[PDB]
Structure 1
Amino acid sequence: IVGGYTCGANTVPYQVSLNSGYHFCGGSLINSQWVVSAAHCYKSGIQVRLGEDNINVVEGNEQFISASKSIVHPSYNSNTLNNDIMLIKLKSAASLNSRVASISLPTSCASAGTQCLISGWGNTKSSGTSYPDVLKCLKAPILSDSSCKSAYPGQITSNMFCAGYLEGGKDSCQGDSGGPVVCSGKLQGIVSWGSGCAQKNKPGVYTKVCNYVSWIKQTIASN
């Protein structure tokens, strides 16, 4: 996250870290046994880390649960990043409490102008690199669809939205991928892609989760 603030330990209780010997992507706990992330984060051998603040220190609220199954969206296109969403089932159910909690799925798509919370452990610099070890937070509005198609001509599908600032300076960044965009207490987006980080007229692009709610429900009802 670029130009954000330190969230504070366990203040974003649905935030997970996907680990394969190192943190490589964020994710969101949607019930005690299922995580949703970005399909471009797909990897074999995922361990899900819950209750994290400092990802390099065991602080006491962590639960490390390995994944038993990963399901990439059946129409994921890695070239265009359309349908960049994946479900991960935990081998056993997480123990839910004030610091490890699931986030609700939307019953409605969020509108442009809605302020949201984006969070993750990704790069905090738009030019160069510096990875934080504690979770970083950023409040950003959903952008109108026409300013989104104007920043990314020919690249925005109906399954994507832009969120952030056309002046730049604040944005999600590498390593924030798969992470949550929560608006009004509901998961509305997944950190998906963009052109660099915090650049002028190049806002973050996010998977539009409200389009996938029935695929998510049906898939967890059957797996």
Structure 2
Amino acid sequence: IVGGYTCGANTVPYQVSLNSGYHFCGGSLINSQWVVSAAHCYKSGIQVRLGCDNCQFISASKSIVHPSYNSNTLNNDIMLIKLKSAASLNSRVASISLPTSCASAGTQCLISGWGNTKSSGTSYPDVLKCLKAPILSDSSCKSAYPGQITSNMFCAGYLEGGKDSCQGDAGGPVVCSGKLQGIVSWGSGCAQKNKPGVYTKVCNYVSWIKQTIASN
């Protein structure tokens, strides 16, 4: 996260880290046995780390990539991880829910992760970083990224640059009024002018998520 702030411990309880000998992606705990993340974060035998600001280690029993995921365009960039054992959440603030409807343009959301904090150079933080950002209109998103924005993507952030998610944040949450509306996916560099973050549009997948959970 570039241009964001230190979240604080126990402030984003649904944020997880995906680990393969190192932190490589984020994810969102949506119930005690399932994590939502990006399809381009798929690896076999992922270890999920939960409740760790800088603490639970739970292996994936399986990681299910969307059947229409396109690794070239990152269309349908969503994955469901089933945990081998149930996660034990700590603080009893309300947790996140799947959306019942899509979020409208202009909606304010919270984006979080342990990714790069610099626009140029390399600086991975030890503690979780947070960013508040609005969802941008579909037309502005398509103008920023001609030919690359599908109905399964939305842009969020700031056109003037300076505030964005970044490498190391993929798979992580975009939460708007308690609903998981986005997944950190891609962008052109980080926090660059007229290049906002691009996010998987979770509301388009709620039927698939519910069916995947039911059948596995």
Q: Determine what percentage of the aligned residue pairs are the same residue.
A: 99
Distance 1:90 1:205 in 2: 27
Between stretches 61-70 and 31-40, larger displacement belongs to: 61-70
Give 1:107's aligned residue: 100
Cα gap change, 1:99/1:171 in structure 2, threshold over 3 Å: closer, same or farther? farther
| TM-superposed deviation, 1:20 | 0.8
SS state of the match for residue 151, structure 2? coil
Is the 8 Å Cα contact of residues 29 and 102 (structure 1) preserved in structure 2?
no
Cα gap change, 1:100/1:25 in structure 2, threshold over 3 Å: closer, same or farther? farther
| TM-superposed deviation, 1:97 | 2.8
Given the two structures, how large is their TM-score scaled by the length of structure 2?
0.97
Is the 8 Å Cα contact of residues 16 and 27 (structure 1) preserved in structure 2?
yes
Which of 133, 144, 153 aligns to 2:137? It is 144
Structure 2, unmatched stretches of 5+, are: none
| TM-superposed deviation, 1:100 | 9.3
**What value does the CA root-mean-square deviation take over the aligned residues?**
1.3
Is the 8 Å Cα contact of residues 14 and 100 (structure 1) preserved in structure 2?
no
SS state of the match for residue 18, structure 1? strand
1:52-111 CA distances to partner (integer Å, 9 max, x unpaired)? xxxxxxxxx911100001100000000010000000000011113317975210001000
Structure 1, unmatched stretches of 5+, are: 52-60
Given the two structures, how large is their TM-score scaled by the length of structure 1?
0.94
SS state of the match for residue 134, structure 1? coil
SS state of the match for residue 116, structure 1? strand
| TM-superposed deviation, 1:45 | 1.7
1:11-48 CA distances to partner (integer Å, 9 max, x unpaired)? 00000000111110000000000001000000112000
1:172-220 CA distances to partner (integer Å, 9 max, x unpaired)? 0000000000001100000000000000000000000000000000010
1:111-158 CA distances to partner (integer Å, 9 max, x unpaired)? 000010000000000011101000000000000000000000010000
Is the 8 Å Cα contact of residues 190 and 206 (structure 1) preserved in structure 2?
yes
SS state of the match for residue 59, structure 2? strand
Q: Summarize the alignment of residues 36-115 of structure 1 with structure 2, pairs less than 5 Å apart.
A: 36-51=36-51, 62-98=55-91, 102-115=95-108
Give the count of matched residue pairs: 214
